[PDB]
Amino acid sequence: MELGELLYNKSEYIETASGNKVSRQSVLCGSQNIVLNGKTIVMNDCIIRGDLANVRVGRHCVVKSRSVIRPPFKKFSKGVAFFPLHIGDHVFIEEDCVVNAAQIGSYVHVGKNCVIGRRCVLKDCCKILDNTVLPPETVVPPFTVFSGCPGLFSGELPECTQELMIDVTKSYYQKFLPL
Amino acid sequence: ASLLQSERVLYLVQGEKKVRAPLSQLYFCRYCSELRSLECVSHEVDSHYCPSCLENMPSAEAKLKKNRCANCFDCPGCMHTLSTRATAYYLACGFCRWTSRDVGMADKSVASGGWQEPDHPHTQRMNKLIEYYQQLAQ
Amino acid sequence: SVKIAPGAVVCVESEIRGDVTIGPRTVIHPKARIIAEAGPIVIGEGNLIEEQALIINAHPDNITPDAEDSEPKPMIIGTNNVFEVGCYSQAMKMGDNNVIESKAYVGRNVILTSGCIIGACCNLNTFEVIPENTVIYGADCLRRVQTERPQPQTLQLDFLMKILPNY
Amino acid sequence: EKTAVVIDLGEAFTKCGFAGETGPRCIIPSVIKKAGMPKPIKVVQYNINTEELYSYLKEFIHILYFRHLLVNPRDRRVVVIESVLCPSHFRETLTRVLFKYFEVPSVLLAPSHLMALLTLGINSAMVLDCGYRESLVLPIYEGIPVLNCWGALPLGGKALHKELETQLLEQCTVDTGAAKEQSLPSVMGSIPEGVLEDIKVRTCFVSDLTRGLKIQAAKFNIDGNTERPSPPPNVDYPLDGEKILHVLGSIRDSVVEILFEQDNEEKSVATLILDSLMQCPIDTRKQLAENLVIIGGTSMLPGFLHRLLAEIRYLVEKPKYKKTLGTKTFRIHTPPAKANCVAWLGGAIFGALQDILGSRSVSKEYYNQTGRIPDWCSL
Ligand SMILES: Nc1ncnc2c1ncn2[C@@H]1O[C@H](COP(=O)(O)OP(=O)(O)O)[C@@H](O)[C@H]1O
Ligand SMILES: [Zn+2]
Ligand SMILES: [Zn+2]
């Protein structure tokens, strides 16, 4: 709201360990294969399944409530297996959002309730708008905005994304405290 | 940029045309002392690239190829980057289930090299008219 | 009131309620919401369910007319059927060889055939039988297109047999 | 020298590409998606303030020169195709945008009718331009446009879109998907122009003269009991997903008739050729009649060229045109590119002529000095 990030008070129940905060409400079925190296946030009722995964997330990663990050299955003639996805640094997944994406780049703002397709690659410094469908096996270049049910080039982003996005994710993390 | 409403508080530019824009969009000019907008500044062309198969093409090759990638294709029904599927290759979309078999294009033995667009029907008549007017203009 | 079948890798951690009738070779993913409110949920072999998938038989909650005498409305589902991420479903009869896409809201009385796909993030409340081997794409408009051949998804289901153990 | 770019700014669609090519590279709706506005504003709009028009054209030309075409604007020349009697302030603005902001080397303001003639190769021909706003005709005799014998009527795309909307609202039958299986009239107060255009193209067609003449008298109902031909089957069209509009068979073949209707004045798209040709010089009559050209996207409508040429030969026998244009042989030219992209193709053929282009075209150095674009009005 007018550049400034607003207050969000968390409850007592949340798994805070080595900077990484993960809501107890949010199930993450397969805790072994999933890894959170940095000071990540995972909001309540969110899913990070371990269906033969290697879900590596960023330094300041944010996943809002009711949102799912599942790896896609690669339809290979040699052997059909689930491809391990790698969420980049400073990644912001918005609320109620579906992600079946392989290799999500750093410094990205994925919009609200937007379905990303199977085996979908996202390069760094991009932005997917809200109520948008990226089809299976699609690529989005840097400094781009993809939107619509087709999921196609809408326009370009501001030049200063790399520097700006840092402030957003770090401010949200700092502003997001217990009550 | 969008999550925080950068499109609220705006900075003004000095010159002929006055514009109200967010600081995120604006650029500072160091040669002189006056910040200028994306509108005010002149735009150039550096490099061309495909959004699917990210391959930096030179300016000369683009003019020959009509600003297009040879390997990658976009579906006609919906506007999305197609994918090569085998059984010996057919072109299919992920969003809509439009195939290359539907319109009746034959499957190619080689993956990329085989696929092509038919020649323009009035291409021979075109060159004859240019050469006539070229001689007449001379 | 549960009719669990061997071979089917239904995960215990997924939520189930009512007079369920489980299929031979079905594979239910965790946090998959199946309810048998009025009539039973009949499941065909190879009918895998992925992520959030609201399958209810609550026509008594939807309308509540107090008509059709008993009105069991038993939820029949076919074989080799992929339920994707966040797709709402409520179909009394549903055919074999059909794949609803992610966040696809299927209607209160919509009958699915073979080789038929619902569009991702597309909602269809209107009651209308789907033609044989035709796909719907987009939310803004339906834009129906007839497919050349039906698409099978057997290999995917078969591999989950190996994964689900110790999860 | 570099291959000069060709742009053709229209109300419905803009043609864009490079000179010495078989057809245009990009053809797109002439609109811009501004932040806040739900429906995108139209870039060409006649009779508005210059500053507001300048901003829209600046926004549009930017999209053409970077997103659609990939080339530096300052490097290579421009060939701006625009119809004769295009509003003064609009053409003055369009040039001022290209010369001031983009800093193009030189613009050439070619009339669309003379460009359409080059594509065929014939030196003299009659040219009808059935566009979006107005269906204009202008006789071109051996390179010289005859402004004296001009002709225009508002029987284009806009007039046809409006006529379709009116007819659909009368016989309105939509299946919303909310106990709307029964015929529901005018659930939506207005239908968006994007939908109406798609219905027109796919559903509606141009009827034969014999069947059309019956349709005219049928809807009139001039002391006759159900004297209409059997219509085509009713086509169901989806509106915004769930809502299914059942289009009546009568609407498909009646909507077009407003173009070819006499309406007492004796002013149709057909009559406009013969009205112009009768006003032409006596020597030029037989050459122009023999060489007819039908450009514009409105004439792409299926079975338009047959109805027009037939309606011509019927209106010839009418006593007004029977004296002058009685024993004349009307023959249509088939241009190399499609009816929509005939105008553009001429500018490309002209753009390929680097030697003549530089001389005829107005240089930026001249515009910066003078500030006076040459027009067919007095200097
Ligand atoms: N391929 C086509 N088939 C049928 N109708 C068309 C086609 N292309 C355009 N049209 C219709 O005819 C009109 C042609 O207008 P156009 O000549 O492109 O614009 P302008 O007259 O402003 O240059 C469009 O508005 C559209 O309604
Ligand atoms: Zn490519
Ligand atoms: Zn497609």
PDB file of N, CA and C in Angstrom, chain A residues 11 20 22-23 40 56 64 72 76 105 121 123 130 143 149 155 174 178:
ATOM      1  N   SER A  11       0.713 -16.373  14.407  1.00  0.00           N
ATOM      2  CA  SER A  11       0.333 -17.073  15.665  1.00  0.00           C
ATOM      3  C   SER A  11       1.565 -17.738  16.294  1.00  0.00           C
ATOM      4  N   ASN A  20      14.525 -20.027   8.812  1.00  0.00           N
ATOM      5  CA  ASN A  20      13.403 -20.621   8.035  1.00  0.00           C
ATOM      6  C   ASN A  20      12.177 -20.772   8.947  1.00  0.00           C
ATOM      7  N   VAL A  22       8.140 -22.013   8.891  1.00  0.00           N
ATOM      8  CA  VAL A  22       7.193 -22.897   8.141  1.00  0.00           C
ATOM      9  C   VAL A  22       5.956 -23.145   9.013  1.00  0.00           C
ATOM     10  N   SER A  23       4.779 -22.710   8.547  1.00  0.00           N
ATOM     11  CA  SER A  23       3.469 -22.842   9.243  1.00  0.00           C
ATOM     12  C   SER A  23       3.148 -24.325   9.481  1.00  0.00           C
ATOM     13  N   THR A  40      13.398 -18.771   4.625  1.00  0.00           N
ATOM     14  CA  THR A  40      12.188 -18.944   3.775  1.00  0.00           C
ATOM     15  C   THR A  40      10.926 -18.807   4.639  1.00  0.00           C
ATOM     16  N   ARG A  56      14.679 -27.355  -3.756  1.00  0.00           N
ATOM     17  CA  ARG A  56      15.603 -26.335  -3.190  1.00  0.00           C
ATOM     18  C   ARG A  56      14.970 -24.955  -3.385  1.00  0.00           C
ATOM     19  N   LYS A  64       2.629 -17.877  -0.164  1.00  0.00           N
ATOM     20  CA  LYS A  64       1.373 -17.478   0.533  1.00  0.00           C
ATOM     21  C   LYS A  64       0.406 -18.671   0.575  1.00  0.00           C
ATOM     22  N   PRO A  72       7.000 -31.898 -11.630  1.00  0.00           N
ATOM     23  CA  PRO A  72       6.364 -32.570 -12.763  1.00  0.00           C
ATOM     24  C   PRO A  72       7.027 -33.913 -13.102  1.00  0.00           C
ATOM     25  N   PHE A  76       9.446 -39.721 -20.365  1.00  0.00           N
ATOM     26  CA  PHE A  76      10.664 -40.245 -21.039  1.00  0.00           C
ATOM     27  C   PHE A  76      10.437 -41.710 -21.432  1.00  0.00           C
ATOM     28  N   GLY A 105      13.329 -19.654 -11.813  1.00  0.00           N
ATOM     29  CA  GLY A 105      14.486 -18.749 -11.682  1.00  0.00           C
ATOM     30  C   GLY A 105      14.370 -17.837 -10.475  1.00  0.00           C
ATOM     31  N   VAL A 121       9.793 -24.008 -17.444  1.00  0.00           N
ATOM     32  CA  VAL A 121      11.044 -23.295 -17.036  1.00  0.00           C
ATOM     33  C   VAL A 121      10.738 -21.794 -16.969  1.00  0.00           C
ATOM     34  N   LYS A 123      12.929 -18.220 -16.284  1.00  0.00           N
ATOM     35  CA  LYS A 123      14.248 -17.546 -16.139  1.00  0.00           C
ATOM     36  C   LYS A 123      14.098 -16.389 -15.143  1.00  0.00           C
ATOM     37  N   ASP A 130      -1.979 -12.325 -12.021  1.00  0.00           N
ATOM     38  CA  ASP A 130      -2.998 -13.139 -11.303  1.00  0.00           C
ATOM     39  C   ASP A 130      -4.063 -13.626 -12.296  1.00  0.00           C
ATOM     40  N   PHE A 143      12.682  -9.977 -17.559  1.00  0.00           N
ATOM     41  CA  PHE A 143      12.075  -8.625 -17.715  1.00  0.00           C
ATOM     42  C   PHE A 143      10.839  -8.725 -18.616  1.00  0.00           C
ATOM     43  N   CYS A 149      -5.350 -16.765 -20.451  1.00  0.00           N
ATOM     44  CA  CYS A 149      -5.577 -18.238 -20.441  1.00  0.00           C
ATOM     45  C   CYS A 149      -4.584 -18.924 -21.382  1.00  0.00           C
ATOM     46  N   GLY A 155       3.840  -7.757 -22.034  1.00  0.00           N
ATOM     47  CA  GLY A 155       4.710  -6.564 -22.070  1.00  0.00           C
ATOM     48  C   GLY A 155       6.051  -6.820 -21.400  1.00  0.00           C
ATOM     49  N   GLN A 174      10.842  -9.409   7.332  1.00  0.00           N
ATOM     50  CA  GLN A 174      11.148  -8.555   8.514  1.00  0.00           C
ATOM     51  C   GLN A 174       9.838  -8.080   9.158  1.00  0.00           C
ATOM     52  N   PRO A 178       5.777 -12.634  14.949  1.00  0.00           N
ATOM     53  CA  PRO A 178       4.750 -13.192  15.831  1.00  0.00           C
ATOM     54  C   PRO A 178       3.998 -12.096  16.606  1.00  0.00           C
TER      55      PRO A 178
END
